[PDB]
Amino acid sequence: GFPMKQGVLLPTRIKLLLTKNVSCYRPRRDGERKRKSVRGAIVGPDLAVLALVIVKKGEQELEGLTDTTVPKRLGPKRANNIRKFFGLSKEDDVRDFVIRREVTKGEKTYTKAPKIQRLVTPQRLQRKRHQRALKVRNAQAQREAAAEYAQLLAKRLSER
Amino acid sequence: GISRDSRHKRSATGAKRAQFRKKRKFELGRQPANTKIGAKRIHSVRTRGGNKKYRALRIETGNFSWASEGISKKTRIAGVVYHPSNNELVRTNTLTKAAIVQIDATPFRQWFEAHYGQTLGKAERKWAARAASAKIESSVESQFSAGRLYACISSRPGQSGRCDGYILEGEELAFYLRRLTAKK
Amino acid sequence: SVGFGLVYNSVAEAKKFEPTYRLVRYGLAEKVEKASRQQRKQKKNRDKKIFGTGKRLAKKVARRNAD
Amino acid sequence: ELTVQSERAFQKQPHIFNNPKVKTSKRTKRWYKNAGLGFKTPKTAIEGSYIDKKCPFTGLVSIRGKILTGTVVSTKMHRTIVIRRAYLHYIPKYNRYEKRHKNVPVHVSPAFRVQVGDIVTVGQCRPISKTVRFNVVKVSAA
Amino acid sequence: ARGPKKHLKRLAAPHHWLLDKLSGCYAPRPSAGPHKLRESLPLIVFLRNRLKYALNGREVKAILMQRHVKVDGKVRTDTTYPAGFMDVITLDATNENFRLVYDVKGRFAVHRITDEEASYKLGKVKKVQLGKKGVPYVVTHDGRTIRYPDPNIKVNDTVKIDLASGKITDFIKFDAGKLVYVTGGRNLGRIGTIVHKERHDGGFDLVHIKDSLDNTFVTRLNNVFVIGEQGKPYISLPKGKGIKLSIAEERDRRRAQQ
RNA sequence: UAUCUGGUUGAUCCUGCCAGUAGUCAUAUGCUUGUCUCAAAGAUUAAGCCAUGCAUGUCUAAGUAUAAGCAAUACAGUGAAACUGCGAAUGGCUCAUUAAAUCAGUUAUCGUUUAUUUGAUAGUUCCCUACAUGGUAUAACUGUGGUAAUUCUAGAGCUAAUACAUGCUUAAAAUCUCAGAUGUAUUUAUUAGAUUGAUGAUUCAUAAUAACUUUUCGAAUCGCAUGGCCUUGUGCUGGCGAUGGUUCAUUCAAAUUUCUGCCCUAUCAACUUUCGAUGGUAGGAUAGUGGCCUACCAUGGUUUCAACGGGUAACGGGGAAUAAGGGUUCGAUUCCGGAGAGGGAGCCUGAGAAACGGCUACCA
RNA sequence: UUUUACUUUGAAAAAAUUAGAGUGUUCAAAGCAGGCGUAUUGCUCGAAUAUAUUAGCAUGGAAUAAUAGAAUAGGACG
RNA sequence: GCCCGUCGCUAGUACCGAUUGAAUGGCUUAGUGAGGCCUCAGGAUCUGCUAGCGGA
Ligand SMILES: [Mg+2]
Ligand SMILES: [Mg+2]
Ligand SMILES: [Mg+2]
Ligand SMILES: [Mg+2]
Ligand SMILES: [Mg+2]
Ligand SMILES: [Mg+2]
Ligand SMILES: [Mg+2]
Ligand SMILES: [Mg+2]
Ligand SMILES: [Mg+2]
Ligand SMILES: [Mg+2]
Ligand SMILES: [Mg+2]
Ligand SMILES: [Mg+2]
Ligand SMILES: [Mg+2]
Ligand SMILES: [Mg+2]
Ligand SMILES: [Mg+2]
């Protein structure tokens, strides 16, 4: 039952100290690494099962290859992702034909349309305005505090 | 790993100390950088407190300051000619603080020409304002005819990733010239 | 006999600020019948081992045991 | 110190620049400091040519801890002495004392001249060696 | 020992909390905050042991999470917020304002104050330092930094802090003859006038204090807090005014109630 | 709360021990055991070995929700799973090591790191998106499986962010360079820092100049209310907050650190020094000082005032027993400090571990 | 304004523990509680004090004990 | 009266003792040396900009 290692290039199985961003291992703790025995990259009789990806269609279709197909389980979620999917350009008001789903559960079937992220919204525009105005307000407050303190210094320096 | 503790390193009476407190991470040392010349390669080390150090390996350019006209041009380090701590560092051209190196001197000559207009080594009257009092020295300009300026490293390449320094001048330069005309 | 007493300004504040065990004693909202502590801890330990939802493991042991 | 430039490196105070462009008077600009606590900076420190980055007056070390007094018992190291610090320790059961001593290695600047004897005052500094945590600040050659 | 401790065992808590011994194994560990660990008084302690408003820590956090308590103008919903000396604890439900001040026994006395003087608070200037861009600032005993301070405000002075704008309205200068609270040591909680300051370069600054009854006690400069001049304290003093009666006259005052 | 008595003689007075006597939060054991309050308890020997079960997880309004999860015109509520964040370095246990080591009291950091809390703090960013950039990205989920077995995972299809990686909007004011540069962060050099702030004291705070960076930061984030003015539109504005973020200060801390103080032993008197021992210069390394390490050099450093070595059925202290006074003995153990997680060593993550209810290797 | 010892005073020497103040836990060991009046829509006292006398720190004293002064005067005074 | 020592029997406790005796534990020269870490490289395959060229 040992999986294959993408680039080991051996016909047997060997132990590697596996890390976060590698196959055959899921770290149970931040920073964890484990020495697990993985199987090499070159196929041989030892393999109980191979894993192949169809990249070319030659002749009569297999009955589980093109006839029966699955839909894409989830539509895009980000605003620009829906734009890039359905082809509509920037100024097209993309909140309308978001793919939905009807739930035949209790004869009410209230569609669960996904929330969209990064959407240009007046709430986010108000947040941006609030931040970019807080910055200038703070800068003006600091400038006037410094000015009045300089006034105090140039007043208390007049005593000689 | 390497430990900077004093629980080893037997006491001043000469007594060998008994061991307690297996090595602590707050006492670790690390490997020397041994910065070489050319094809900049800097590695980021994660240090205590989440901070970062930069191990310079194979550094090619350094920021060197004349300190007499205050220019601090960025230039190329040619090689190491003298090191007070280890001649092996000179042999291996290992870049290190306080190493005496040779720098290109071309940016310094270009700045001298754009500033004084006085043909150092081979908006009109700014050269007049920077008046005849422009003679630098009889040892810092004779190196411009060879295009190699003696300099001393001042940063720590293994710590800061940079190989900055200053051009030798005056009695420091005389000292290092004596050392070089002895050991060369 | 000497004890302590509280008088809440309203039954709303009574329900909001009173301990659940004392409300149960009195006769207000009653105990939630949780499993024993050992069983709940063993259960969360058993759920620690499985990674995701579990339906994957369900359909995987749907074929095995037996063939 | 008998050809002060006696090391492999050039000995100099850091960031104390003698500009060869300006035609100053001394041409050997020398930094010093007042150590504090009423220890007078000696004229040897003011006018000498030694470097001693561990000197409490011309070096990079500060006197900020305990001020101790002791008797110099060794001057055989370079810029370092060992001072003897005799005291009496109380033994309560006998209501009496016993003589005890502790040797203390101290860094002595070239500003001072110190021989065996020469009760000295020393001030705590940062650890400047494996065993040295004190700098001579008053020679008091008794 | 591998990191910062998060527990405070009972019998390790500061004694001036008057904590019960056989209540539990642990005390409320003061979270990091303005004053200190030892010189602090957690809001749970002040709400469940100094006023008896709450009966448990659960009830303390119940009081806290509905924004009732307020430390120095802000809400401070932290169950173990380290409130300390000169802090204003105002509660609007049961509207009343307390100033955490030391009684003469050295505990945080419950000292009701009025809003017209709870508006502000006092602060002992811990340090005067130039910040980035050459902007001077003062650091006070409660960990407050205040920019552009008066150029005559030095260390050990006291500053009156608006506590709504957080700025210096006035400042008392440390000098012989001003009213000082003692905020540490054996005489913790006493009030008096500065008589003399012994310098001790390198060592510790000492100050001799003469209370109203002409008792003269010396103490370290670290824990003396200027609170105004004699007879004109810039704040309201607690019920005892830091007199430090001896046990005999204390027993006498007690038996004067028959 | 200052006490003695029996035993050497035929008898005596002594020395002197044996014996008696009293206590022990001081342990065992025998016999006995009705009541109330309090509650030590696998330390001693084996820091010996351990079946089994539990002991570290965590969600608000406020990071990410199309659960084919529930329930009454995009989800408006709840919400498994998962990603993200934070925590898991606290606690609890034990006393094996450990004799200038720990520890105690007392110092220092002008010798450093410091998540968090608290307070303050950032108009300067650009060489055809900002009315908001990408997948170069993936999880959960869907379907195909291998192994007897693990908190094992491969293969294929989506999918977001406060994950990841990029990237603009803020004039005005503002001086130097020969139109450009001028925030902050890093590195170097120089200058001021006086008599124009502070300290007992600095090459301090801080500012300036000239440059330098395998780019640092300068919110492309979230909630609840929606208000005011108006070119009435996709207008302009404006709240209270949350989270995040540079630097400084603060706090919780950490690490080093001054002085003085440890039991028996000389049938331990010299020890340390090639192989760092003591110091100097320089460098490297560290968060930082420092022979911490390296190179060169010097020949030092400790010691009868007991070094060095050996023993401890030795963790240190607060304390405990007994006690006229002085002392003697004890302290594994309710608090503080230390160390360890079978013996060593190494290391990932992280502010913080040389972590062991984390990993890696060797030994048993 | 030589150098010490000594001694007085003061700060320090966590809490618990110890001595110990108050307090009818029914007494007591203990604990830091509690007390005082009423038909309130509540008033009030406390959780002291002493000691850790080694080491360091600050201060008063100047007996006791040690130490140093001007002798080839390189002495003191303005 | 009291008394001393050899020798002989019994029992016990230590001592010396061929056996280059034995076992256990500590320290240690030398040899070999796992492992992680730093470093010289290396390049499966994984997408991007146009065989040119970069990044992981
Ligand atoms: Mg007896
Ligand atoms: Mg045991
Ligand atoms: Mg612990
Ligand atoms: Mg500086
Ligand atoms: Mg060094
Ligand atoms: Mg002991
Ligand atoms: Mg032991
Ligand atoms: Mg103990
Ligand atoms: Mg034991
Ligand atoms: Mg403990
Ligand atoms: Mg540990
Ligand atoms: Mg075990
Ligand atoms: Mg470990
Ligand atoms: Mg365990
Ligand atoms: Mg643990």
| CATH number (domain holding residue E125) | 2.40.50.740
Handedness of CA D126, D130, D133, D137 (dihedral sign): negative
| Of residues E148, E150, E151, nearest to A145 (C-beta) | E148
* Contact check, Cβ <8 Å, A152/E151: yes
Q: How many CB atoms lie within 10 A of CB E14?
A: 19
Half-sphere exposure of A158 toward its Cβ, with a 13 Å CA cutoff? 5
Q: Which amino acid is at A88?
A: L
Report the C-alpha gap between E233 and E226 in whole angstroms.
Answer: 9
D17, two tokens: 């620049």
Residue B46 and residue B52: Cα distance in Å, rounded? 5
Angle at E197 between CA E195 and CA E201, to 5 degrees: 175
Measured between alpha carbons, how far is D45 from D109 in angstroms, rounded to an integer?
8
With touching defined as 3 or more inter-chain CB pairs under 8 Å, the answer for chains A and E is: yes
Contact B82, B100 (CB under 8 A): yes
What distance in Å separates the CA atoms of residue E29 and residue E41, rounded to the nearest whole number? 10
In 3D space, the residue among E105, E124, E152, E97 whose CA is nearest the CA of residue E228 turns out to be: E124
* Alpha-carbon span A14 to A93, nearest angstrom: 55
Q: Which residues contact A114 (CB under 8 A, 6 or more apart)?
A: A74, A75, A77, A98, A99
User: Cα–chain-centroid distance for residue B170?
Assistant: 18
CA distance B166 to B70: 10
Q: Where are the alpha helices (DSSP H) in D11-66?
A: 43-47
Query: Which tokens sit at A83?
Result: 């734009």
Which residues have a Cβ under 8 Å from the Cβ of A42 and sit 6 or more positions away?
Answer: A9, A10, A11
Say whether B172 and D12 touch across the interface (CB within 8 A).
yes
Whether E203 and chain D come into contact, CB under 8 Å, resolves to: no
Q: What is the rounded distance in angstroms from the CA atom of residue E244 to the CA atom of residue D79?
A: 56
Using a threshold of 3 CB pairs under 8 A, tell whether chains D and E touch: yes
- Is E190 exposed, middle or buried, given 0-12, 13-18 or 19+ CB atoms closer than 10 A? buried
Alpha helices in A8-121 (DSSP H): 79-86
Residue E255 placed within a domain: no
The most distant pair of C-alpha atoms in chain B lies apart, rounded to whole Å, by 76
DSSP structural state of residue A78: B
B chain contacts of residue D21, beta-carbon cutoff 8 Å: 68-69, 133, 136
Amino acid letter at B134?
A
Three-class DSSP category at B1: coil
Compute the radius of gyration of chain C from its Cα atoms: 22
| Cβ atoms of E76 and E212 closer than 8 Å | no
**E62 and E138, same domain (yes or no):** no
Angstroms from E190 CA to nearest CA on chain D:
31
| From D8, D17, D105, residue closest to B84, measured CB to CB | D8
Tell me which residue of E104, E102, E124 sits closest to E213, measured CA to CA.
E104
Residue D37 sits at the chain E interface (C-beta within 8 Å):
yes
Residue E106 Rama label (left phi>0; alpha psi -120 to 50; beta): left
Closest CA to E239 of E203, E191, E195: E191
Query: Domain containing D7: what range?
Result: 3-142
Ligand 2 centroid – CA A148 distance (Å) = 74
The DSSP annotation for B58-119 comes to: SB-EEEEE-SSS---EEEEEEEEEE-SS-HHHHHHT-B-TT-EEEE--HHHHHHHHHHT-S-
* Degrees, nearest 5: CA angle A79-A82-A87: 125
| Distance of A81 CA from F228 C1′ (whole Å) | 37
Q: Which residue has the tokens 């279709």?
A: A61
Closest to E149 in 3D by CA, of A142, A154, A152, A143:
A152
**Domain tally, chain E:** 3
Q: Which CB contacts under 8 angstroms, 24+ apart, belong to B20-27?
A: B27/B3
- Taking the C1' atom of every nucleotide in all shown strands and the CA of B32, the nearest one is F284
CB B29 within 8 A of CB B8: no
Interface test with E, best of A149, A156, A159 (most E CBs within 10 A): A149
**In chain C, which residues have their Cβ closer than 8 Å to the Cβ of E58?**
19
The answer to whether some atom of strand H lies closer than 7 Å to the beta carbon of A55 is no
Q: What three-state secondary structure class fits C26?
A: helix
Is E196 found in the same domain as E143? no
Neighbours of E137 (CB within 10 A): 16
Strand partners, E125: E140
Q: What residue has token string 């007042």? A: D34
CATH code for the domain in which residue A82 is found: 1.20.5.2650
This structure was determined by: cryo-EM
Query: In terms of domains, do E189 and E215 share one?
Result: yes
Q: For residue E34, give every residue at least 6 positions away whose Cβ sits within 8 Å of its Cβ, in sequence order, or none.
A: E72, E82, E83, E84, E87, E142, E143, E144
Instruction: Give Cα separations from D121 to C59, D47, D85, D124 (angstroms).
Output: 85, 22, 11, 10
Domain that holds residue E140: 121-171
Number of separate helices (H) and strands (E) present in chain C:
4, 0
- B102 strand-pairing partners: B79, B150
Enumerate the residues of chain E whose CB falls inside 8 A of the CB of residue D64.
202
Residue B59 main-chain phi, psi, to 5 deg: -90, 140
> DSSP assignment of chain E, as one string?
--S----EETTSS-GGG---SSS-SEE-PPPS-SS-STT-EEHHHHHHTSS-S-SSHHHHHHHHHTT-EEETTB----TT-EE-TT-EEEETTTTEEEE-EE-TTSSEE--EE-HHHHT-EEEEEEEEEEEGGGEEEEEETTS-EEES--TT--TT-EEEE-SSS--EEEEE---TTEEEEE-SSTTTT-EEEEEEEE--TTS--EEEEE-TT--EEEEEGGGEEEEEETTEESS---TT-S----HHHHHHHHHT--
Distance from the alpha carbon of residue B26 to the mean position of ligand 12, in angstroms? 29
Total structural domains within chain D: 1
Q: Would you give the DSSP letter of residue C27?
A: T
In the structure encoding, which two tokens stand for residue C29, read together?
A: 């909202």
Q: Nearest-CA distance from E80 to chain D in Å? A: 37
Residue E126 tokens read as 């811990």
Structure letter (DSSP) for residue D120: E
Report CA-CA distances (Å) from C41 to B52, B63, C51.
43, 63, 17
The first and second tokens of residue E185, run together, are 């040591």
* Structure token digits, residue E119: 């508006």
CA E165 to the chain's CA centroid? 20
Residue A34 CA to ligand 9 centre (angstroms): 38
Domain B106-147 in CATH 1.10.168.20? The answer is yes
The reply to whether E219 Cβ lies less than 7 angstroms from strand G is: yes
Distances (CA, A) of D95 to D88, D90, D99, E23: 12, 7, 14, 45
User: Measured between CB atoms, does B85 come within 8 Å of chain D?
Assistant: yes
Assess whether E5 and E93 both reside in one domain: yes
Chain E CA closest to residue A154: E151
| E68 and C CB contact within 8 Å | no
Phi/psi class of residue E30: alpha, beta or left (left: φ > 0; alpha: ψ in -120 to 50)?
Answer: beta
Distance from CA of D80 to the nearest CA of B (A): 15
Are E221 and E235 members of one domain? Answer: yes
Q: Write down the domain spans for chain B.
A: 1-30, 31-105+148-184, 106-147
Please, are residues A149 and A157 in contact by the beta-carbon 8 Å criterion? Answer: no
Question: Is D123 within 8 Å of D135 (Cβ atoms)?
Answer: yes
Kindly report the bases of strand G lying within 7 A of a protein C-beta atom.
Answer: 3-6, 10-12, 14-17, 21, 31-33, 41, 45-49, 54-59
CA A67 vs CA A59, A62, B131: distances in Å = 14, 8, 91
Tokens 């097209």 correspond to A92
Q: Give the β-pairing of E216-220 and E206-210.
A: antiparallel
CA contacts within 13 A on the Cβ side of A121:
9
Our measurement of CA B71 to C1' H32, in angstroms, reads 58
Neighbouring CB atoms inside 10 A of B117's CB total 14
Q: Which residue of E has its CA nearest to A149?
A: E148
CB-count burial class (<10 Å; 0-12, 13-18, 19+) for A117: exposed
What's the rounded Cα separation, in Å, for the pair A104 and E73?
55
Kindly state whether residues E127 and E110 are assigned to the same domain: no
Could you write out the DSSP letters of every residue in B115-154?
HT-S------THHHHS-STT---SSSSTTTTTT-EEEEE-
Helix, strand or coil, per DSSP, at residue D88 = strand
Which residues in chain C precede a discontinuity of more than 2.5 Å between C and N? none
CA(B70)–C1'(F10) in Å? 120
The structure was resolved to a resolution in Å of 2.0
Maximum CA extent, chain C: 72
CA atoms within 13 A on the CB side of E92: 9
What is the rounded (10 degree) CA torsion for B141, B146, B147, B149? -60
Q: Terminal CA-to-CA distance of chain E, rounded, Å?
A: 56
Q: Is the CB of A75 under 7 A from strand F?
A: yes
Which residues fall within 8 angstroms of residue A154, CB to CB, at 6 or more apart?
Answer: none
Q: Measured between alpha carbons, how far is A121 from A127 in angstroms, rounded to an integer?
A: 10
Strands of the sheet with E168-172, listed across from one edge: E145-147, E135-140, E121-131, E158-161, E168-172
Is the separation of the CB atoms in B55 and B68 below 8 Å? Answer: no
**Cα–Cα distance between E197 and E175 in angstroms, integer?**
8
Nearest CB to D5; choose among B67, B133, B175? B175
Which residues, in sequence order, are bridge partners of residue B62? B75
Contacts for D22 with CB less than 8 Å, ≥ 6 apart: none
Instruction: Name the nt closest to E245 by C-alpha to C1'.
Output: G48
Say which residues have a Cβ less than 8 Å from residue C48's Cβ, sequence separation at least 6: none
In this structure, what is the dihedral angle of CA atoms B130, B132, B133, B136, given to the nearest 10 degrees? 100
Going by their DSSP bridges, the two strands E101-102 and E108-109 should be labelled as antiparallel
Q: Which residues of B41-59 are buried (b: 16+ CB within 10 A; e: fewer)?
A: ebeeeeeeeeeebbbbbeb
Alpha-carbon gap, residue E247 to B59, rounded angstroms = 76
E202, D67: Cβ pair inside 8 Å?
yes
A87 Ramachandran zone, left/alpha/beta (phi>0; psi -120 to 50): left
Residue B43: CA count within 13 A, CB half-sphere = 10
CB E147 within 8 A of CB A145: yes
CB atoms within 10 A of CB B153: 24
Residues 8-67 of C with CB under 8 A from E: 17, 19
Give the Å distance between the CA of E99 and the centre of ligand 15.
43
Of D85, D87, D86, D82, residue with least CA distance to D114: D82
DSSP B163: -
E151 → closest Cβ in A145, A146, A156: A156
Site of tokens 């005849």? B132
- Indicate if CB(A19) is under 7 A from strand H: no
Range of the domain at A93: 72-160
Q: Residue B177 and residue E5: Cα distance in Å, rounded?
A: 58
C14 alpha carbon – ligand 2 mean position (Å): 54
Alpha-carbon dihedral angle through residues E62, E64, E69, E71, given to the nearest 10 degrees? 160
Residue E73, CB-side half-sphere exposure with 13 Å CA sphere: 11
Q: Is the CB of A7 under 7 A from strand H?
A: yes
| Residue D136, token pair as written in the block | 């001579």
For residues E87 and E23, state if they share a domain: yes
Residue C52 CB coordination number (10 Å) = 7
Residue D92 contacts B where some CB pair is shorter than 8 Å? no
Tell me how many degrees the CA angle B157-B160-B161 measures, rounded to the nearest 5.
55
**CATH number for the domain that contains residue D61:** 2.40.50.1000
> Chain B residue with minimal CA distance to D7?
B84
Q: Are strands E101-102 and D67-74 parallel, antiparallel or unpaired?
A: unpaired
Chain A residue at shortest CA distance from E146: A145
Among E137, E171, E205, where does a domain finish? E171
- Does the distance separating the beta carbons of D9 and B170 come in below 8 Å? no
Parallel, antiparallel or unpaired: strands B165-167 and B61-65: parallel
B136 at the D interface (CB within 8 A)? yes
The 3-state DSSP composition of chain D as helix, strand, coil percent (nearest 5) reads 5, 30, 65
**Could you tell me where the beta strands, DSSP code E, fall in chain D?**
67-74, 80-91, 96-107, 117-124, 134-138
Which SS3 state, helix, strand or coil, does residue A17 take?
strand
Q: Which strand F nucleotides have any atom less than 7 A from protein CB atoms?
A: 39, 53-55, 57, 64-72, 74-75, 80-82, 87-92, 97-102, 107-111, 113-123, 131-135, 140-147, 149-161, 169-170, 172, 178, 184-191, 196-203, 205-207, 209-214, 219, 221-226, 234-235, 237-241, 247-262, 271-273, 276-296, 298-309, 314, 326-328, 334-341, 344-356, 358-361
Report the C-alpha gap between B178 and C5 in whole angstroms.
95
Amino acid at E250: E
Q: Any CB–CB contact under 8 A between E202 and chain D?
A: yes
Tokens encoding A104: 């035949």
User: The tokens of E202 are what?
Assistant: 């390198």
Q: Edge to edge, what strands does the sheet with E112-113 contain? A: E69-71, E88-91, E96-99, E112-113
**Token reading at D13:** 């105070």
Compute, in angstroms, the gap from residue E9 CA to the centroid of ligand 12: 28
Contact at CB, E202 and D37, closer than 8 angstroms: yes
Nearest CA in chain D to E201: D37
Contacts 24+ apart (CB under 8 A), C23-31: none
